[PDB]
Amino acid sequence: LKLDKENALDRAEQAEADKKAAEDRSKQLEDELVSLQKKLKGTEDELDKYSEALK
Amino acid sequence: LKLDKENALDRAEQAEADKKAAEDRSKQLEDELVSLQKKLKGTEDELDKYSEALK
Amino acid sequence: DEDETTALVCDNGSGLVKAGFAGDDAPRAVFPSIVGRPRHQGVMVGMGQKDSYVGDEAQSKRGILTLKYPIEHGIITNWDDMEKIWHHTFYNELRVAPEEHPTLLTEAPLNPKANREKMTQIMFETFNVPAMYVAIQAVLSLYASGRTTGIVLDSGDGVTHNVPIYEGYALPHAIMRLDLAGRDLTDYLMKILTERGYSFVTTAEREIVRDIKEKLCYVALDFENEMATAASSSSLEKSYELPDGQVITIGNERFRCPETLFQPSFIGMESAGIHETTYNSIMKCDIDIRKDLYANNVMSGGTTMYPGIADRMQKEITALAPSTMKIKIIAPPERKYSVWIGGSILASLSTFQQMWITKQEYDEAGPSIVHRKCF
Amino acid sequence: DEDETTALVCDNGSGLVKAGFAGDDAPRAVFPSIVGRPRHQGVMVGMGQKDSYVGDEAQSKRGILTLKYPIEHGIITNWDDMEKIWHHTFYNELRVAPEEHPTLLTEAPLNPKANREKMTQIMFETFNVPAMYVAIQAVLSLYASGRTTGIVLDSGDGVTHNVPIYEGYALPHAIMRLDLAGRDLTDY
Amino acid sequence: DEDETTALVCDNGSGLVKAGFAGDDAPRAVFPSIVGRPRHQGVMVGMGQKDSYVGDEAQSKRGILTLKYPIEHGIITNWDDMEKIWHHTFYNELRVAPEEHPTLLTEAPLNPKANREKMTQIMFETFNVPAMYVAIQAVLSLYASGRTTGIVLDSGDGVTHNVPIYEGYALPHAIMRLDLAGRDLTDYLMKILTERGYSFVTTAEREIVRDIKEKLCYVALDFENEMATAASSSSLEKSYELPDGQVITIGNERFRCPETLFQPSFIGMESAGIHETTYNSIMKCDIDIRKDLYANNVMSGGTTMYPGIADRMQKEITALAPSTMKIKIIAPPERKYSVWIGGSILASLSTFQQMWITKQEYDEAGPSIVHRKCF
Ligand SMILES: Nc1ncnc2c1ncn2[C@@H]1O[C@H](COP(=O)(O)OP(=O)(O)O)[C@@H](O)[C@H]1O
Ligand SMILES: Nc1ncnc2c1ncn2[C@@H]1O[C@H](COP(=O)(O)OP(=O)(O)O)[C@@H](O)[C@H]1O
C-alpha cells in the first residue's frame, strides 16, 4: 500500500492545496467581482448622473 | 497505512470535488468579473462620453 | 450496457486516442495510438509474447517492441492498425460493438482528405457501423470550452492547427497551420536529456521520455531569466525515477525543450513560434472580429498542460496585441481531453442528428461521401 | 404600443432609415438601410445564425457579413430587402403595425418613378397599410425648417436634388440635380 | 558593363523584381524580392553559410533559409532589404547602376504615399542617382501594350489594381483595388495541397508551391465542367516532382486555386471577382469612354499566364457587356514583363524628358518632391 498511499497522498495534499487555491481564487474573484459590481454600480450611477446632467 | 490510502484518497477526492466546485466558481466569477469589468469600462467609457458631451 | 443507440466517440490523435460514448463528459478509456511489434524473441516461459500489441498492451510490453503510431501529423496512413485500435477500444473497454451504434471520429480543418475517408470507410466496411460523422476539431474544442467565438489552439501531438472562429463560422483566410507539435517536443526532450548524460534512443525510451515530459517540463514565463537561474542553481532541477531504478534530473532542459513551441527552430522548423502563430490568427481577421478573438483565446489538446503555457501565451499575445483590447486564455481542466468531450457534445445535439452519414448513403456513394456529408 | 391611430413616417434613405410616428418631433428609432449576409462557411453545429440580418442586426453581426444597401442613390431596387427592413422597423422596434396606421414615405422629386410606385405597392400589398403618401424631400425640408419659401439643398447620402420652392410652389425649371452625395464623400 | 547613357528601370513587387535599362524591350534579369537569412546554427567548419543572401542567392539556398519579402501588397516597408536587393540587381547582376544613370521605379496608382517617397529617396541618397521618376504601373501597362486607352489588369504578387486610362488620362473613380494576387494564390494552393496529403508550411515550401502553380495550374474557360471531371477522374491530374523525390499530382485543385481570381471567396476575400472588377472599371467611366475600354481590356503583370484567362476574361466581360459592340483582350507574350517594358518606354520617350527629378531639385526639396514632380 505505500505506493497507493503515496499516490493518494500526493493527490490528497495537492488536491487540498488546489481546493484551497480554488476557494481562494474563487473567494478573491468573488470579492473582486463584488468590487467590480460596486465599481460598476458606481459607473452606472455616475453615468446616469452624467447622462442626466447632460440631458 | 492500511486505511491511509483511503483516507488520503477520500481527502483527494473530496478536495478535488470541492476544488472543482470552487474552480468552476472561479471560472464563473472570473467570467462575470471580466464581463462586469467590461460593463464597468463600457459605462466608464460612457461616463467620459457623457462627461465630454456634458462639458 | 447502454439502453439507447448513443454514438460512440473516438478522438484519434497522432499521440494518444481518447474514447467513450456520446453523452458522457469524459472518455471511458485512453489508449496511445499504438500498435506494437516485437523486435526480439522471448526466452522465458510466462512472458506473454504476442505477434502484435494494441494500445495499452503496446505500452505494457514496450521494452522489446517497436511502437508504431498509424497516424502521421494528423493522418491515418495505416488503416489495419486503426482497426486493431478501434476494435479494442470499442469492443473491449467501452464494451460496445459499433454494429449497433453510430460513430463519431475527428480531424483538423486542413487534415488531408484521405483521413476522413478512411475513418468513415473503416467504420462502415470493417465494423458495420450504422452511421458515421467526421467532426471538426475546432468545433469540438469550442463546444468543450463553452465558446462559439475564439482562437482554437488545439496543439496536438502531430500538428498545431491554429484556426480563428467567429459566431460559429470559420475564418479560413487566417488559418496558420504549424508543423510543430507534442511529438517534436518528446523527440527534442530525448535529445536534450542525452546532452545531460541520459540517452534515450529506442521506442520504449521514447515513451519514458513522454512520461518525463508530461510530469517535469514547463515553458517558463521568462525563458532567459529562468534559463540563467536553472543553469546556475540546483533549485530549479527536478528528479524522475526511470523504470530500471536510475534517477534522471532535468535543469534548464526542463524548459529549453518546451521552449521549442515558442522557438521551433530548435527542432529545425521555420516558424515564428506558437505565440506569433496564434497572433497571426487574431490580427488577420477583420477589424470588427479581432476584439472578440483576443478576449477568447481557447486551448484544447495537450501541451496546453504545461504549468506556464496559458499565462505565457496570454502575455505574448498581449505584447503583440494593440492596446485597449482584452486578451484572455481559456485553459479548462478538460485540457487534452476537450476534443473528445466536444465530440460527445456534437454527436448528441438535436441539431446534429441530420449530419450523420447512414450505412445506406455510404454504400450507394462509396468512401468519398464523407467529403460532401461532413464538412 | 401606441394609443392612437396616427400616421407612420419612415424616411428611407440610401444611408439610414429614420422612422417613428406622425406628429412627433423625432424618429423613435433609426435603422441602417441594410440587409447583411454571411460571407463565411459555418463551422459549428447548433449556432443559430441567419441567412440574412436586418437593420441594426446587420450592423451588430457585421464582423462576418457583407452589408448591402437596397437603395442606390435614393432609389429602391431591392424591394425584398426593403420589405425586410420595414417589417423589422415597424413590428419589432417601433412597435407600430402599418395595418392599423396610414404611412408616409419620402423621396427626391426627380427620383425615378419606380421608387414611389414600388414603395406604394409594398406598403399596400405586403403590409396592408390603410393609406399611403409619398412625400417630396424639398417639401419636407421647408416644413421642418419653418419655411414656405427657400432652396432645399439636401446634401444627403444618395443624390442631391437642389429644389427651389416659393410661396409653397415648385419652381421645377430651376431644379439642379447633382450626382454627388455623402456616400461618395465617404468613398473619396 | 554597359556604355549606353540611358535610364534604368525596375518593377518591384512582393514576389519578384524585373530590371534592366531603358530603351530596350525586355528586362535584362529578374530577381526575387528576397533577403534570405540562415535559420540554422552551423556546426561543422568549412560549410560556408552567409549572414545574408540576396535575390536568387536567397531563393537557391532557401531549403535552409528563412526568406524575407520587403514589399507588402505593393508597398516597400523594409527599405533596407530593398537597398540590398537593388544593389545586387544593379551592381552585381544587371551590371549597370543608378550612380551613372537616371532611374525609374514603379508603383500602383493608389499605393500609400510613403512608397514613392522612399523609392525616390533611396535612389538619390544610397545610390546617388542623378535623377528620379516614380511611375504609375497603369501607364506603363498600356504603353507596353500599344495603348493610350484601356483597362489595366495589373495582377501582381501582392495586389491587383484594376485601373482605366482614356486618351492618356486617368479615370481614378473607376479603380477597383483588389486584395488578391499571385502570393495569395500560392498560399491557397499550399492549403489545398495540404488537403491532398502534401502539406506545405515553410517559406521554402511556399516557393515549391509557387513553382508547381506556375507550371501546372490554370483558370479554365469553363470552371464547372473542368471541376466536375477533375474532381471525378485521374485523367485531369498532372504530376510534379518535389525536390525530395516525392511526386504530387493535382486534380481540380489545379484550377480551383487560380479560380480564386474569379471567386475570391475561396480564400475568405470579400470581392466580386476579377471579371466584375474589370467590368466596373469600364462601367464606372462615362458612356463615350465605356465603349473604348470594352474594346481595349489590357492584361499586365503575371497570373495572366494561366491557360483560359485571356479567353475567360473576354467571355466573362462580353457576357455582361451589351451586344453588337466588340469586347477584346490584349494579352501579348510581354505578359508579366510588360510593366517593366512600359517603364523602359516611359523613361526613354522624348516626351518624358522633362518629367525627371534631377539631383538638384531633390537635394533642395527632399523626398516630398515626388508629389511635385512625379504624380
Ligand atoms: N503536462 C503536459 N506537458 C507537456 N505536454 C503534454 C502534457 N499533457 C499533454 N501533453 C502532450 O499532448 C499530446 C496529447 O495529444 P491529444 O491532445 O490528447 O490528441 P487528441 O486531441 O486527438 O486527443 C501528447 O504529445 C502529450 O505528451
Ligand atoms: N505561369 C504562370 N502561371 C500562373 N501565375 C503566374 C505565371 N507567371 C507569373 N504568374 C504570377 O505572377 C507573379 C509575377 O508577375 P509580376 O507581375 O511580374 O509581379 P510584379 O509586378 O510584382 O513584378 C508571380 O508571383 C506568379 O504568382
Numbering used by the authors:
A (entry chain P), B (entry chain Q): 11 to 65
C (entry chain A), E (entry chain B): 1 to 375
D (entry chain C): 1 to 188
Paper text:
The thin filament consists of actin, tropomyosin (Tm), and troponin (Tn) in 7:1:1 stoichiometry, and Tn is composed of three subunits: troponin C (TnC), the Ca2+-binding regulatory subunit; troponin I (TnI), the inhibitory subunit; and troponin T (TnT), the Tm-binding subunit. Tm is a long α-helical coiled-coil protein that binds over seven actin subunits on one of the two long-pitch helical strand of actin filament and forms head-to-tail connections with adjacent Tm molecules to produce a continuous helical strand along actin filament. Upon Ca2+ release from the SR, however, Ca2+ binding to TnC causes conformational changes of Tn and a shift in the azimuthal position of Tm on actin filament to allow actin–myosin interactions. Here we have determined the structure of the entire thin filament from human cardiac muscle in the absence and presence of Ca2+ by fully utilizing the recent technical advances in cryoEM and image analysis.
The resolution of the 3D reconstruction is 6.6 Å at a Fourier Shell Correlation of 0.143. The density of the core domain of Tn together with a long two-stranded coiled coil of Tm is visualized clearly on each strand of actin filament, with one of them at a higher position than the other by the axial rise of actin subunit along actin filament. The Tn core model thus built binds to each strand of actin filament over two actin subunits. The C-terminal region of TnI comprising the inhibitory region (residues 137–148), regulatory switch (residues 149–160) and mobile region (residues 163–210) is present as a mostly continuous density (red) extending up along and between actin strand and Tm coiled coil from the C-terminal end (Gly 137) of the TnI helix within the Tn core. This density, identified as the C-terminal one third of TnI (TnIC), reaches up to the second actin subunit above the one that binds to TnCN. The other one (dark blue) is also highly elongated and is extending back from Gly 199 of TnT across the actin filament strands and down towards Tm on the other actin strand to form a long N-terminal α-helix making a specific interaction with the C-terminal end of Tm near the head-to-tail junction. TnTN residues 87–150 fitted to the map extends further down beyond the head-to-tail junction and reaches nearly the bottom of the third actin subunits below the Tn core from which the TnTN density extends. This means that the entire Tn structure is extremely elongated, binding to actin filament over seven actin subunits, of which the upper four are bound by TnIC and the Tn core and the bottom three of the opposite strand are bound by TnTN. Therefore, the conformations of the TnTN linker region (residues 151–198) connecting the Tn core and the long N-terminal α-helix formed by TnTN residues 87–150 are distinct from each other for the pair of the Tn complexes, indicating the flexible nature of this linker region, and the axial extension of Tn2 is shorter than Tn1 by one actin subunit.
